[PDB]
Design a protein around this motif. Structure first.
Motif, PDB file in Angstrom:
ATOM      1  N   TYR A  35       0.800  -1.221  -0.044  1.00  0.00           N
ATOM      2  CA  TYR A  35      -0.146   0.051  -0.007  1.00  0.00           C
ATOM      3  C   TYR A  35       0.838   1.284   0.007  1.00  0.00           C
ATOM      4  O   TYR A  35       1.555   1.408   0.832  1.00  0.00           O
ATOM      5  CB  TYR A  35      -0.602  -0.121   1.290  1.00  0.00           C
ATOM      6  CG  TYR A  35      -2.044  -1.161   1.125  1.00  0.00           C
ATOM      7  CD1 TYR A  35      -1.618  -2.438   1.676  1.00  0.00           C
ATOM      8  CD2 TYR A  35      -3.275  -0.817   0.379  1.00  0.00           C
ATOM      9  CE1 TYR A  35      -2.611  -3.323   1.467  1.00  0.00           C
ATOM     10  CE2 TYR A  35      -3.983  -1.980   0.683  1.00  0.00           C
ATOM     11  CZ  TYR A  35      -3.862  -3.114   1.021  1.00  0.00           C
ATOM     12  OH  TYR A  35      -4.813  -4.234   1.008  1.00  0.00           O
ATOM     13  N   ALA A  36       0.483   2.086  -1.122  1.00  0.00           N
ATOM     14  CA  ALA A  36       1.308   3.375  -1.075  1.00  0.00           C
ATOM     15  C   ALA A  36       0.597   4.611  -0.893  1.00  0.00           C
ATOM     16  O   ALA A  36      -0.598   4.718  -1.579  1.00  0.00           O
ATOM     17  CB  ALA A  36       1.987   3.437  -2.500  1.00  0.00           C
ATOM     18  N   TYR A  37       1.290   5.428  -0.047  1.00  0.00           N
ATOM     19  CA  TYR A  37       0.430   6.961   0.237  1.00  0.00           C
ATOM     20  C   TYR A  37       1.283   7.867  -0.500  1.00  0.00           C
ATOM     21  O   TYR A  37       2.417   7.864  -0.603  1.00  0.00           O
ATOM     22  CB  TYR A  37       0.670   7.018   1.753  1.00  0.00           C
ATOM     23  CG  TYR A  37       0.336   8.310   2.589  1.00  0.00           C
ATOM     24  CD1 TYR A  37      -1.047   8.465   2.560  1.00  0.00           C
ATOM     25  CD2 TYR A  37       1.304   9.163   2.772  1.00  0.00           C
ATOM     26  CE1 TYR A  37      -1.321   9.739   3.368  1.00  0.00           C
ATOM     27  CE2 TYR A  37       1.044  10.401   3.386  1.00  0.00           C
ATOM     28  CZ  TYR A  37      -0.476  10.700   3.667  1.00  0.00           C
ATOM     29  OH  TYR A  37      -0.837  11.873   4.271  1.00  0.00           O
ATOM     30  N   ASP A  74       2.496   1.079   3.386  1.00  0.00           N
ATOM     31  CA  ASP A  74       3.952   0.262   3.180  1.00  0.00           C
ATOM     32  C   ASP A  74       4.829   1.194   2.569  1.00  0.00           C
ATOM     33  O   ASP A  74       6.108   1.112   2.722  1.00  0.00           O
ATOM     34  CB  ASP A  74       3.817  -0.810   2.351  1.00  0.00           C
ATOM     35  CG  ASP A  74       2.753  -1.819   3.149  1.00  0.00           C
ATOM     36  OD1 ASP A  74       3.031  -2.416   4.210  1.00  0.00           O
ATOM     37  OD2 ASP A  74       1.914  -2.424   2.068  1.00  0.00           O
ATOM     38  N   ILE A  75       4.419   1.890   1.550  1.00  0.00           N
ATOM     39  CA  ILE A  75       5.293   2.824   0.953  1.00  0.00           C
ATOM     40  C   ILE A  75       5.188   4.478   1.159  1.00  0.00           C
ATOM     41  O   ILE A  75       3.708   4.850   0.995  1.00  0.00           O
ATOM     42  CB  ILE A  75       5.259   2.706  -0.642  1.00  0.00           C
ATOM     43  CG1 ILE A  75       5.922   1.227  -0.962  1.00  0.00           C
ATOM     44  CG2 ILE A  75       5.936   3.606  -1.540  1.00  0.00           C
ATOM     45  CD1 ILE A  75       6.140   0.742  -2.211  1.00  0.00           C
ATOM     46  N   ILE A  76       5.923   5.124   1.697  1.00  0.00           N
ATOM     47  CA  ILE A  76       5.839   6.751   1.837  1.00  0.00           C
ATOM     48  C   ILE A  76       6.284   7.507   0.524  1.00  0.00           C
ATOM     49  O   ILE A  76       7.477   7.471   0.249  1.00  0.00           O
ATOM     50  CB  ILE A  76       6.730   6.973   3.131  1.00  0.00           C
ATOM     51  CG1 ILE A  76       6.166   6.158   4.267  1.00  0.00           C
ATOM     52  CG2 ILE A  76       7.103   8.362   3.166  1.00  0.00           C
ATOM     53  CD1 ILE A  76       5.036   7.070   4.957  1.00  0.00           C
ATOM     54  N   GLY A  77       5.205   7.374   0.078  1.00  0.00           N
ATOM     55  CA  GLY A  77       5.277   8.348  -1.552  1.00  0.00           C
ATOM     56  C   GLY A  77       5.117   9.756  -1.723  1.00  0.00           C
ATOM     57  O   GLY A  77       4.847  10.383  -0.652  1.00  0.00           O
ATOM     58  N   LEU A 111      11.052  12.948   2.944  1.00  0.00           N
ATOM     59  CA  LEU A 111      10.528  11.923   2.709  1.00  0.00           C
ATOM     60  C   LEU A 111      11.029  10.682   3.148  1.00  0.00           C
ATOM     61  O   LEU A 111      10.506   9.899   3.997  1.00  0.00           O
ATOM     62  CB  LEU A 111      10.197  11.906   1.236  1.00  0.00           C
ATOM     63  CG  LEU A 111       9.392  10.628   0.802  1.00  0.00           C
ATOM     64  CD1 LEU A 111       7.778  11.072   1.129  1.00  0.00           C
ATOM     65  CD2 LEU A 111       9.322  10.482  -0.784  1.00  0.00           C
ATOM     66  N   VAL A 112      12.404  10.338   2.776  1.00  0.00           N
ATOM     67  CA  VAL A 112      13.329   9.289   3.364  1.00  0.00           C
ATOM     68  C   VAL A 112      13.344   9.289   4.938  1.00  0.00           C
ATOM     69  O   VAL A 112      13.231   8.252   5.560  1.00  0.00           O
ATOM     70  CB  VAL A 112      14.411   9.289   2.796  1.00  0.00           C
ATOM     71  CG1 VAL A 112      15.639   8.708   3.339  1.00  0.00           C
ATOM     72  CG2 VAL A 112      14.478   8.831   1.470  1.00  0.00           C
ATOM     73  N   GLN A 113      13.476  10.429   5.489  1.00  0.00           N
ATOM     74  CA  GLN A 113      13.643  10.575   7.021  1.00  0.00           C
ATOM     75  C   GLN A 113      12.169  10.021   7.817  1.00  0.00           C
ATOM     76  O   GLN A 113      12.388   9.390   8.636  1.00  0.00           O
ATOM     77  CB  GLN A 113      13.911  11.834   7.285  1.00  0.00           C
ATOM     78  CG  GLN A 113      15.488  12.273   7.124  1.00  0.00           C
ATOM     79  CD  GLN A 113      15.571  13.668   7.329  1.00  0.00           C
ATOM     80  OE1 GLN A 113      15.050  14.506   7.087  1.00  0.00           O
ATOM     81  NE2 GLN A 113      17.000  14.150   7.464  1.00  0.00           N
ATOM     82  N   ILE A 114      11.256  10.339   7.202  1.00  0.00           N
ATOM     83  CA  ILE A 114      10.006  10.054   7.346  1.00  0.00           C
ATOM     84  C   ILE A 114       9.674   8.734   7.440  1.00  0.00           C
ATOM     85  O   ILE A 114       9.378   7.855   8.213  1.00  0.00           O
ATOM     86  CB  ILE A 114       8.818  10.721   6.899  1.00  0.00           C
ATOM     87  CG1 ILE A 114       8.705  12.296   7.180  1.00  0.00           C
ATOM     88  CG2 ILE A 114       7.365  10.085   7.048  1.00  0.00           C
ATOM     89  CD1 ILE A 114       7.700  13.217   6.159  1.00  0.00           C
ATOM     90  N   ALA A 115       9.984   7.961   6.222  1.00  0.00           N
ATOM     91  CA  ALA A 115       9.952   6.649   6.057  1.00  0.00           C
ATOM     92  C   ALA A 115      10.961   5.896   6.877  1.00  0.00           C
ATOM     93  O   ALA A 115      10.469   4.920   7.367  1.00  0.00           O
ATOM     94  CB  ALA A 115      10.355   6.263   4.625  1.00  0.00           C
TER      95      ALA A 115
END
Ligand SMILES: OC[C@H]1CNC[C@@H](O)[C@@H]1O[C@@H]1O[C@H](CO)[C@@H](O)[C@H](O)[C@@H]1O
Ligand code: NA
Ligand code: NA
Length: 367
Positions: free
Chosen positions: A209-211, A238-241, A271-275
């Protein structure tokens, strides 16, 4: 080390997520929407892509779009036939490619399209008068997904894993599920129901699941707060998009090219830091420069800013939008080149980069 929200996901789906988590540090998968369906100057061929015509390789990630499926249409809102779409999904997956699906759901209240802003979310969520409609709509995806299955010699069913990316760009106001048309809490209820229904009631096991909020409506001084507007919770994603057309030269953006490059890097870093904080994987789920008017777009405006920062570079993939066919759509629109387009050689350079993977150099993602 990231774990899917579906604890029972198929072996292939688990493997894809694990392998994206490993590959992301040193590599970036390239994606294209509707890549096998048509291109700017062709439609009908059953095994062709503008991307391949330029580079010799298919994209690593194939995006597809379901809008109209829920109404029982035989083709989607851009006239992509659903049976052909199933064939193309299966063909791409058979070559080792990755599949991702978005859904521009038609407005159930008015019968208009996703851009008809007539309020509907409150009616669709649990307790809402149209909750039966949401179930019926989701059931059409369950049926579509069944048309992707094969059954092996032992009687076991197998599916392509799908990165399912519903209800996108919800912090914008252009879709009926967007800000101004649905309350934040109702959006969250819609997302959570979508996951409960597909994962738990219908027992689909091949979804990731991607947001995907839109960057253009996030305040860069307060990125995390803006990103998390409508976020449904870690048990649902699942994916922080991210959809970011803004920092790659959108016509309405008055920022200088240098400011835009810096903002692209900053958006992906955060974005990466959030993920990372959430134990997820980040991706640039949509981007591009419509009509590819920017010299050296690929290397200078996309790859360069991603590669400039080691956090930004930990996104797993980048997908660009579709190459609309001119003979049947009158508005010129494309995000990948085709032979002879001005950015074609720079796109070859992007392909050639050791960082960037197209279908031809993917490792085996599904074991
Ligand atoms: O501008 C490109 C994208 C940005 N994300 C939202 C999406 O709606 C938009 O493109 C439209 O996509 C729909 C669905 O494929 C299509 O009908 C339109 O013609 C645009 O391509
Ligand atoms: Na990466
Ligand atoms: Na490459």
């Amino acid at each position: 080390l990231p774990a899917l929200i579906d604890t029972q996901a198929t072996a292939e789906t688990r493997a894809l997520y694990r392998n994206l988590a490993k590959l992301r540090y040193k590599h970036l998968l390239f994606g294209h929407e509707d890549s096998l369906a048509y291109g700017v100057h062709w439609e009908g061929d059953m095994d062709r892509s503008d991307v391949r015509d330029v580079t010799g390789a298919n994209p690593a990630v194939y995006g597809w779009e379901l809008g109209g499926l829920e109404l029982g249409h035989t083709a989607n809102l851009d006239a992509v036939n659903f049976e052909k779409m199933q064939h193309w999904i299966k063909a791409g997956y058979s070559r080792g490619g990755v599949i991702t699906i978005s859904w521009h759901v038609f407005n159930p209240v008015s019968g208009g399209n996703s851009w008809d802003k007539t309020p509907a979310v409150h009616e669709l969520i649990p307790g809402g008068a149209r909750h039966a409609t949401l179930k019926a709509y989701l059931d059409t995806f369950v049926a579509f997904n069944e048309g992707l299955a094969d059954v092996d010699a032992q009687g076991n069913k197998h599916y392509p894993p799908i990165i399912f990316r519903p209800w996108h760009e919800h912090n914008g106001d252009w879709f009926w599920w967007g800000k101004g048309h649905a309350s934040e809490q109702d959006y969250i209820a819609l997302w959570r129901f979508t996951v409960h229904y597909l994962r738990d009631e219908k027992k689909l096991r091949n979804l990731i699941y991607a947001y995907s909020p839109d960057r253009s409506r996030i305040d860069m001084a307060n990125f995390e707060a803006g990103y998390l507007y409508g976020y449904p919770g870690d048990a649902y994603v699942d994916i922080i998009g991210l959809d970011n057309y803004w920092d790659v030269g959108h016509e309405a953006n008055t920022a200088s090219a240098d400011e835009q490059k810096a903002a692209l890097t900053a958006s992906l870093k955060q974005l990466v830091q959030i993920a990372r904080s959430k134990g997820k994987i980040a991706a640039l789920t949509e981007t591009g420069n419509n009509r590819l008017t920017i010299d050296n777009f690929w290397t200078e405006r996309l790859l360069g800013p991603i590669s400039a920062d080691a956090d930004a570079s930990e996104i797993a993939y980048v997908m660009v939008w579709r190459n609309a066919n001119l003979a049947r759509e009158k508005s010129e629109q494309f995000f990948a080149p085709f032979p002879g387009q001005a950015t074609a050689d720079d796109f070859k350079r992007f392909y050639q980069s050791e960082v960037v993977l197209f279908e031809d150099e993917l490792p085996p993602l599904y074991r």
